Amino acid sequence: TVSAPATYGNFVLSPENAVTAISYHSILADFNSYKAHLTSGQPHLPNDS
Amino acid sequence: FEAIFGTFCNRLEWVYFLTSGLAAAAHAIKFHDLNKLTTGKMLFHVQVP
Known part of the structure; x- marks a missing residue:
């Protein structure tokens, strides 16, 4: 059995x-319009997990 | 999998007929049956002094 x-x-x-x-x-x-690279809490990358 | 990115540039200079100064020479009418029309005519009656 495998x-x-x-x-x-x-x-x-x-x-x-x-x-x-x-x-x-x-x-x-x-x-200074871009803001997605800095945030509070745990950092989170968009993912499909 | 990793990606190669490209940029789209979307800005345009919008123009309008009615805002133009050239529109002053025109009398702007909409007529949604214009496809049926073949020729428009306009006739005059004048008597001389």
């Missing part, structure tokens, strides 16, 4: 690409 994966694997979005997006927004957003 234990095998019950279901297929998932698409997972790399956490790093958030940094690239934030750098682009830093270039493109108005002066």
Whole structure:
């Protein structure tokens, strides 16, 4: 008897690409208009977990 | 999976017919049956002094 994966694997979005997006927004957003990069509480990256 | 980003620029200079100074020469009418119309005519009667 062999234990095998019950279901297929998932698409997972790399956490790093958030940094690239934030750098682009830093270039493109108005002066001090962007605020998503700073917040209170536990930091949270958008995820499908 | 990680992504490659691109930027869209969306701003445009909107213009309107009625706001233009050229519109002063025109008399602007809407007529939703214009497809049926073939020719419009306008006729005058004058007697001389």
